[PDB]
Amino acid sequence: KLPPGWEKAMSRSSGRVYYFNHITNASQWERPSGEPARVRCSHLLVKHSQSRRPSSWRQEKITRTKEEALELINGYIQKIKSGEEDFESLASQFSDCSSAKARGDLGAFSRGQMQKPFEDASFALRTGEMSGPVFTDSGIHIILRTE
Numbered sequence: 001k002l003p004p005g006w007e008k009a010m011s012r013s014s015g016r017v018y019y020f021n022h023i024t025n026a027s028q029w030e031r032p033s034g035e036p037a038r039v040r041c042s043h044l045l046v047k048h049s050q051s052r053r054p055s056s057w058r059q060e061k062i063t064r065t066k067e068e069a070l071e072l073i074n075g076y077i078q079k080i081k082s083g084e085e086d087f088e089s090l091a092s093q094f095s096d097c098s099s100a101k102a103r104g105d106l107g108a109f110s111r112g113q114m115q116k117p118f119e120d121a122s123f124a125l126r127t128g129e130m131s132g133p134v135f136t137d138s139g140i141h142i143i144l145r146t147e
């Protein structure tokens with residue numbers, strides 16, 4: 001029916017059908033369009049107190065709860081989707097990954113290199129698509145597939 005991971009759902013506020021991807025946590029009103037050895041992704045990471053390494057270039061001691069990290073992620077997603085901010089701008093400013101200095105770019109990678117939820121989301125994104133919140137042991141990610 002739909003590309004990998006996508007399913008139909010009903011909006012609770014509007015009653016209109018939308019589409020949700022349970023691999024990427026992407027959600028959208030529009031019916032999703034239409035696997036390579038490698039993809040290229042950028043990401044914005046928000047770490048929390050239960051991150052594998054609760055430290056980043058932004059903060060020596062990361063203390064925010066996972067719930068607070070998710071709220072931050074949700075707010076960045078809203079600004080990206082509204083066009084108020086660019087993904088790259090938010091990643092450079094607020095990603096708890098050292099890839100922040102490359103606008104979140106991780107370069108290209110294969111299956112078998114990244115943490116599984118990140119890998120699965122990356123490979124289920126189409127080129128140009130953005131994930132919803134993706135959870136790993138590092139924290140919570142927004143992933144943008146660029147190639």
Ligand SMILES: O=C(O)c1cccc2c1OCCO2
Pocket residue numbers: 097098099100101102105106
């Ligand atoms: O170590 C770094 O400064 C760095 C710079 C750009 C991209 C990265 C980086 O480290 C984590 C992987 O992705």
Ligand SMILES: O=C(O)c1cccc2c1OCCO2
Pocket residue numbers: 099105106107
């Ligand atoms: O793997 C790393 O530590 C690293 C360091 C600098 C730049 C990078 C890196 O990983 C891939 C992205 O580009």
Ligand SMILES: [Cl-]
Pocket residue numbers: 064
């Ligand atoms: Cl915070």
